[PDB]
């Protein structure tokens, strides 16, 4: 049946954020009034962490392993789904469709997404999600 769930990893296909990897946080397969097309709110990473390695100090390690995230609602036609998924928890109250009516709490949503992405990336799990797509 339907495969594009609220835990999927999606390759964003258009817009300023093109070629980035995001995670769907809330899908809507039936268009709402303001958006007749089916869509989904996702959280992605804009600046991937740099290729860290040994033989460098952990101050440099921390400086390089820093993520810049974005939160956006996308049309389904501009999203390419994958077979991967990440179980990273995102707070629904902070990250929701109401975040776009002001620029104050959108910064909070991006902050929370960035913090969660960093603490998950530091563990080394889902490492594919944190490497840029070479295209």
């Amino acid at each position: 049946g339907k495969f594009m769930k609220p835990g999927k990893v999606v390759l964003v296909l258009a817009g300023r954020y093109s070629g980035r990897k995001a995670v769907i946080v809330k899908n809507i397969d039936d268009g709402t009034s303001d958006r007749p097309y089916s869509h989904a709110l996702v959280a992605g990473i804009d600046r991937y962490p740099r290729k860290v390695t040994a033989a460098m100090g952990k101050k440099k390690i921390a400086k390089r392993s820093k993520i810049k995230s974005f939160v956006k609602v996308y049309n389904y036609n501009h999203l390419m789904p994958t077979r991967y998924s990440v179980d990273i928890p995102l707070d629904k109250t902070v990250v929701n469709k109401d975040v776009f009516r002001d620029p104050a709490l959108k910064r909070k949503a991006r902050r929370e997404a960035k913090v969660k992405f960093e603490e998950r990336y530091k563990t080394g799990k889902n490492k594919w999600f944190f490497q840029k797509l070479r295209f």
Binding site: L11, L13, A14, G15, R16, S18, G19, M80, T82, R83, L133, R134, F135
Partner: protein
Amino acid sequence: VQRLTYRRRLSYNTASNKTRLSRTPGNRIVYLYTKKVGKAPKSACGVCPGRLRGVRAVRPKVLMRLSKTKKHVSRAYGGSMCAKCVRDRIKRAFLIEEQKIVVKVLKAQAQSQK
């Protein structure tokens, strides 16, 4: 009718000696020499015949004085490749990577059976 003459010393209708009529405040018709028409950059795809959007179509040395945003569009490969070809490239890269992964896993399975 006032027949009018050239203003430079080039008396031939070459590609650089192109003019247009204008009415000066002195109520006279004079030649103004026009710059050649620029072209918007062509896509790096090599297939799409149209020219890129969002980029000013001026002569190459005029690009030196334009601002950065007037010469490109804020997207990956923006200002040099069209959006359709960017999407196709993205899909192609991801799909070939997946194909390689599944081929490698099938090879590993075959080796395990062997």
